[PDB]
TrEMBL record, chains A, D:
Involved in unsaturated fatty acids biosynthesis. Catalyzes the dehydration of short chain beta-hydroxyacyl-ACPs and long chain saturated and unsaturated beta-hydroxyacyl-ACPs. (R)-4'-phosphopantetheine binds at G59, R102. The keyword Metal-binding does not apply. This is 3-hydroxyacyl-[acyl-carrier-protein] dehydratase FabZ. It comes from the Bacteria.
């Protein structure tokens, strides 16, 4: 109810490889906040192109990870932990604002997502927060996403 | 004013599977740039976004816009110079005012329209839209920095 | 008469990285089909064909025409029937008169134009060309047999 | 200069993963013929999509393999094992005729290419032959290739 | 006594890129198994092991032997039962006495020879060699456990 | 001298994607021991097949990661951080012994390799140790390698 592992994440989020960017959830408060993280390793395909000989986890993917964290929070806050309801849902990005990248994320980093709900109404959730590595803010972002039934 | 994939490759450091611009159709130094990327089902990203429902990631649309803006920045600074380019990389600094209006899917020709908002040194702030068949599919503003590897 | 990736996924058994048709623009039962696949640098195939010079494989151009031709033969007899589609398998027996005239590269919209040359029972012979912006880049003739999966 | 292993093939053909479809060359006679093969294993990305639950090596890739074999033959017939010149040349299909797929190719099969030189004048090479598995013809084809400049 | 990839897929839980057994050529319940995996350049592993010098990772050879053992272990206890197989996975418990004598490269037919040293319930202990053209390229002993998925 | 990041590992080991299984080196004592680690994330191709709906880092890859760490230890003991000499060397692993798996490794785990030189005779190096996640031993292993000219 407050801590979830990759198996639980796979039953809630529709995202899959190579776009499931959340490995574990450490803190979860319904309608309120979520703390999760994704391990960053060299053994990830994106590193073949970003950049050759200089592995830098793409900033936009950090945003994606925060969004997915927000989505997990949004879903469980809505229907609780229900894989059956979740398997036919998808998530759409509506907006992204105030994104600032301060420190590059590289292989070996534990990218921690901290997101708080700024406002939600039905299926539309607007979250905002930071991504941290070893306690330091590596990025900050604000985004609004919509959960939608697969049509 | 047409730059093809082999030209883009000589300027941008990005490579597979993060090189998201296939061709440059228009270029005007310190002003604007129009480019595009073809979207096909035969892209690994679609295996997971989403299964049975291919939607080109909104964040990758923004990445493509950033890269387009990057090409504009590189050439505006040093002209088409492969030698200088090979020592640089690019970092995302900020992203703002992005809105997605229509989902981009396999079969779409994703066209990037970026104009220079402000710039100085290696720091470039551009903004514009992403379009499919003449309709705005997304809006975005972003600031990136060019740097030595 | 226009089918999108979602529809194609329901008729063809092909999946990544071998589903080479992104969208169907037109189709006349027992007569012809026009379909296409977008070519983008963001495709795994370009890693090896070739390094520093991306050229869409000619055999894959032919594979794309085949898939289009199969979609044609299938829908002509059964229409858009996902259920029946799973009970059937369209495989190719022969390929002839293949000619490559122009290389296909990232940024190109590879259009498949096939017409039914002849058909008898489950044996369907299709032929046509592959076009990029109105010009013929390849041509070929193929014969397929439709069988129970 | 009748047997060549992957290290030698890599020095002659420009093809790389996932389009280098020749693993070894067992017989080679200048201007006359070549015998080579490609091992087929389930551990190949193509099988993820061709097809799910039913691994079948794409017929067009069988043709591609015959062509690469033919190209190696054409090049070495003209310049011998010359890696430096190989990287300045490239072979392209001009045409493909009389392709017949007789038996499906699947993981565990050793796809053996048998190409014979039907006609050659300068950079223009016409070859034809078969693809075999355990002595049986699984496919046949003819093709005309062009040895062109890389730049 | 022989099983093809279609059969293996139905028994072992491994999938791409970790199903490293292609065909079973010999099987004696609770005693031994001979199988093999074709090695080809067209495998992703080779992109990193190593550039311009493809060598099939020694640890993957052991993995292949384990998988063969797992196939032996399961068919010995349930025969060819796809329904009960999909409810299990295999867990590596120990590895011992492995020696790598000859490098394995593209074009090689990696043959697995395993015999059960001991077995008790879901716990199976096998040992043997990996052969290429009749020569031992590797040796190993390992203990695995079949567990409820 | 004691801390190496991915850029440094890339200049010493020949391994590349998808077989470079060491992300960072936290500590190194020439001729004695090495502590390093590889983050485990779901966004790795191997998890597509090991296993579907049940991601478990392959036990053999933990052993491979340990071997890589040993090789970096051996190499750096001999010539220190030297990319140029690194390109002319290779270390093949001859044997692997006494490996035991105690706890499965999964996405979200920080797989920490702990290797120590058990014996160094000529071109032969024997290393051994454990793989740990959050202080617990998840795997043990002994391995022998040989240093040779590329
Ligand atoms: C004569 O060369 C051949 C080429 C392809 C085939 C073939 O069987 N293709 N596809 C077969 C097939 C595909 C799916 Br999907 C499936 O589920 C099943 Br049952 C099939 O037999 C047979 C012969
Ligand atoms: C030309 O690149 C090569 C790299 C490695 C080899 C090889 O067969 N095995 N291993 C090499 C290798 C090198 C380092 Br240094 C190392 O730490 C480890 Br472990 C290795 O396996 C051969 C060729
Ligand atoms: Cl970035
Ligand atoms: Cl999106
Ligand atoms: Cl081609
Ligand atoms: Cl086929
Ligand atoms: Cl090895
Ligand atoms: Cl395991």
């Amino acid at each position: 109810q407050s801590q979830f592992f990759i198996e639980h994440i796979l039953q809630i989020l529709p995202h899959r490889y190579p776009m499931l960017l959340v490995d574990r959830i450490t803190e979860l408060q319904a309608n309120q906040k979520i703390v999760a993280y994704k391990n960053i390793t060299f053994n990830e395909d994106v590193f073949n192109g970003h950049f050759p000989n200089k592995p830098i986890f793409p900033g936009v993917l950090i945003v994606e990870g925060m969004a997915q964290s927000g989505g997990f929070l949004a879903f469980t806050s809505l229907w609780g932990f229900d894989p059956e309801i979740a398997k036919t849902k998808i998530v759409y990005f509506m907006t992204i604002d105030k994104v600032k990248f301060r420190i590059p994320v590289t292989p070996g980093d534990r990218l921690e997502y901290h997101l708080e709900v700024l406002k939600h109404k039905g299926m539309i959730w607007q979250v905002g927060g930071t991504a941290q590595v070893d306690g330091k803010v590596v990025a900050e972002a604000e985004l609004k996403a919509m959960i939608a039934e697969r049509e």
